[PDB]
Amino acid sequence: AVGIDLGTTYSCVGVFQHGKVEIIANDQGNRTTPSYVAFTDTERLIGDAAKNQVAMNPTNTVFDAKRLIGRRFDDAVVQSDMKHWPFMVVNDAGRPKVQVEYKGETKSFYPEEVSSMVLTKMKEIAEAYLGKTVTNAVVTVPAYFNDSQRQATKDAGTIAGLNVLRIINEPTAAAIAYGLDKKVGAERNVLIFDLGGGTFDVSILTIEDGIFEVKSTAGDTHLGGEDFDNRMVNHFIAEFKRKHKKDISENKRAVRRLRTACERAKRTLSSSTQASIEIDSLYEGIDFYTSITRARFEELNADLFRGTLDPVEKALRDAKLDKSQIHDIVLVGGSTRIPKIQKLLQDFFNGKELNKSINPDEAVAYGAAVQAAILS
């Protein structure tokens, strides 16, 4: 019995054992696997291998399937999203499907078929670690998912040859990971602040005698760590123009290498007040060297960082609660590591301590694994 966090950009799988949870690493030792699937002239790729060939095969590399799962083609969200994806999305009897080139054959797949492929890889990852065949699993989904999206996600699990014990809410899984459901007192409230690579969700839960109830949800489905990276990228592209009179914005390879450098710098700024970026021959044989302080990084993302507080206020209002009525605050999602984000939330809640001891990229999977052990 394993717990799977089926994320939009990456997925994670854990298993409860020895009274503790273990987050399973894949072949490459990565504890998270990209929710990518690639179709080439010869094979089908899933995970890291799929992401590594994105540049050479952009139109046949699929991601964000989670944004389509359970939706209708004529859905306002689908129509809007497909204008930003490099792969094709076609209409099939009102149902959305991704169309790609696979072995010289033009084929199409249902959102849940793509996800079943990601789940299959996660199943295989868990099997390699336990040694046995893995069939039972608890899968998570955003609290705002409707019955259609939940069913389509379960089906994805079924197609992957898994016996989905249950479909649970991501925020609920996070609260379970911190045992916020096992303690003394009366009906308490919980705010889950989930900021991943491309999605931001705020959820308010109420736990009464071990029973969970979603009170409200808010957030921004297109706000994540990648946006903070974009702000830095644009910053250095303009910096390069000034120092070298050259514009690299139209050079894919240059932009991508810069983006990779910015991701590392961002990580460094999570534990250091300054970071250095170095890139050999970034453009026309010119070396790129520079630095950036935490303060400047925060200024570049000011509107995005403080904007995360609006969904908090909205969630509070929809739950009909005053912020002083929140008993626990939980941090999930890689981006909750950014000091400014943590400080903004803490200050908003007048210094209240934040639950964050559990690796924010693994908390959801962690909680699902716990729930799986209980239902096994």
């Binding site: 540049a55 390879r253 290498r257």
Partner: protein, 84 residues
Amino acid sequence: SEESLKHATRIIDEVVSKFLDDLGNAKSHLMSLYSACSSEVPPGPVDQKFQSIVIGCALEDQKKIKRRLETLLRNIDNSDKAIK
């Protein structure tokens, strides 16, 4: 006699092509790493993790690493040429 020469050649060929395939996998692996260091459009895959590790190195190390990869790919290519 002419058949013997053919059968003999096949046996050696199978040993060689086997090695050449092992030499091809090494080339693809090194090629995914090299492309992670290059400013050119990648002809094939690009090891993302390796690209991060490289960019995290000092400028001259990035140059070192890329130089080491170009050398290995060259020595690997000389090997493929001589051994057919």
